Each structure stands twice: as C-alpha cells, then as structure tokens.
Design a protein around this ligand. Structure first.
Ligand code: LY5
Ligand code: LY5
Lengths: 195, 44, 50
C-alpha cells in the first residue's frame, strides 16, 4: 500500500506508516502529495506534476469533460475505489458532480475493477476512462489509436516521502529542482514513458 | 510545456508558517477552490 | 523586484531579500520556486504549476 488512514482507529498503513514509524528514511515511489499525508510526513517538492484526465479513442468530437457530462450515449467511468474515482465522489464542482451522479448510478456498468479492464473497454466499446494523466500518457504511447481528451481536471504532484522533521527533505527538494532545471527529469520521463 | 516550474508562497528559512501554508494550499487544491480562483481571474 | 542574487557581492534583492532579512513574514505573489531561491528562503509547495 501507498498509505491511507483508517477511518475508525486513525492508524496509517503503507509507505506512509513506514515513514511515521521511522522504519524507512525515504519513500521513493509515485507517492501523491496530499493534504492528509502532508500533515503526518514531510514530502519533497514534486518530481512530477500531473492531474486527472480522460482516455478515449481518437477521431471523435469529444474535447472535454463537459462534452461527456452533458450526454449519455458515450459511457464513462473510472477504476473503482481508486484516487480518480474518489476525486469525483467529492467534487462539488458542477460538471464533476454531474459526472459522479452518472457513474454512481450506472456503477455496475461503468466502474471497472482494474486499469487494464478499463483500457479494454475504451478499445472495444464506446467508452471513456477517467484516470491519472501519467497513466494515460503511458497508455497512449503504447496504443496509437487512443488519446487524452482535454486537459487536466485537477492538479497534483508525486513527491519523495520522508519522516516529519527529516533533514533529507530539503536536500532532496533542492536536488529535484536542479535535476528539473537541467532537463534531466524530463529525459528520465521520456526514457520510461516513450513507446 | 517546455520546462516545468511552480509558483509558491515565500517565507523566511525556518518559518513555522511554511508547512501550514503548504497544507492549506493542498487542501484548497483538492477541494477545487484554486481551480475556481484561477478561472475567476483568467477567463475572458 | 521578485528576487535575484548579485553576481559580484552576493546580496539579494526584491521580495526574497525582504524574507531573508525578516522584514516580511510571507511573500504572496507569483514567486517562482527555483534552486537558487530555495537555498535561501523556505517556499510553500506550489499553488500553481506551469
Ligand atoms: O500515492 C498514491 O496513493 C497514488 C498511488 C498510485 C495510483 C495510480 C493510479 N490509480 C491506480 C488504480 F488503478 F487503482 C486507479 C488509478 C487512478 O486512480 O486513476 C498511479 C500511480 C500512483 C500515484 N499515487
Ligand atoms: O519569480 C519570478 O522571478 C517570476 C516573475 C514574474 C515573471 C512573469 C513572466 N516574465 C515577465 C517578463 F515580461 F519580463 C518576461 C516574462 C517571461 O519570462 O516569460 C510571470 C509572472 C512572474 C513569475 N515569477
């Protein structure tokens, strides 16, 4: 697990718990920087910034989440219980609240149990998948008829996790900023994402 | 985008407000409020 | 000024200098988070990425 807080006993799990308990010095992983986590561990500044977006087939007139929200012919959904679904379940933003109304009602039809199932649904049926833009890029580099639709729907980053008070936090932040400015993180991203 | 960078609130080194502002900014983002603020000031 | 370091005497200017000298508590502005600045002040995480 990456790290979440139990809603009844308040205990953490995953990598976040390893840091809290000082069992690890660093969590180097695509650990999303979030409000609830940043209160209990110390994150570096983000080595990648991203957001939710839409995976869909190429060659259609759909261009935004709005275009999806204001119709019913094209189904759309998300991986059940993932971070993306969770965003929609909570957005008080208009469009995204409507989208969640739809997804929640037709959940047996449009929420999928895995990213892999979701991608097959986009490929074989008239369906769009809401997911993190990093995953979408990985997929579209490997599936030439799929594309990202629209821009980012929220904004968030991945950071290196450290225990609260760690002296490595600010050192890692400065190193990440320098790697970014030198163009090296961009090279690293292309190395691992290009198809 | 050709490079990547962010705008942040600056504080003096060692400020106790730095981490409090970070948590508040992250919550504002997740709640959709910074996106609303951006649209308010940027939309033509 | 936003804040840069003089290449000869190493002194800062702008909002960055106000923070270093504890003349301000916060700089709330589109202050870019950069390597050279983060070494001398403490930034929040970004409110905008671009
Ligand atoms: O920190 C975290 O909790 C997450 C975990 C992990 C989450 C995935 C994306 N989710 C995996 C999932 F398939 F379960 C659903 C997907 C999503 O919510 O869009 C991307 C890489 C990670 C980014 N950080
Ligand atoms: O922190 C900083 O130094 C900068 C200052 C300020 C810089 C402008 C952009 N520049 C103003 C400029 F017109 F002088 C040139 C332009 C650019 O370099 O593209 C945008 C808002 C700010 C973002 N942070």
């Amino acid at each position: 697990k990456y790290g979440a807080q139990d809603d009844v006993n308040g205990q953490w799990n995953g990598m976040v718990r390893e840091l809290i308990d000082h069992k690890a010095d660093l969590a180097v992983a695509p650990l999303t920087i979030t409000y609830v986590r940043e209160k209990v561990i110390d994150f570096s500044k983000p080595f990648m910034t991203l957001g939710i977006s839409i995976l869909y087939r190429k060659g259609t007139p759909i261009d935004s989440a709005d275009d999806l929200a204001k119709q019913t012919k094209i189904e759309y959904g998300a991986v059940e219980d993932g971070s993306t679904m969770t965003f929609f379940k909570k957005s008080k933003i208009s469009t995204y609240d409507k989208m969640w109304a739809f997804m929640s009602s037709r959940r047996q039809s449009v929420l999928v149990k895995s990213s892999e199932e979701g991608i097959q649904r986009v490929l074989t049926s008239d369906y769009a998948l809401l997911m993190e833009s990093t995953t979408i890029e990985f997929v579209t580099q490997r599936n030439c008829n799929l594309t990202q639709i629209g821009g980012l729907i929220d904004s968030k980053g991945y950071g290196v996790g450290t225990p609260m008070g760690s002296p490595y936090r600010d050192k890692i932040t400065i190193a990440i900023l320098q790697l970014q400015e030198e163009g090296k993180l961009h090279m690293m991203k292309e190395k691992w994402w290009r198809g």
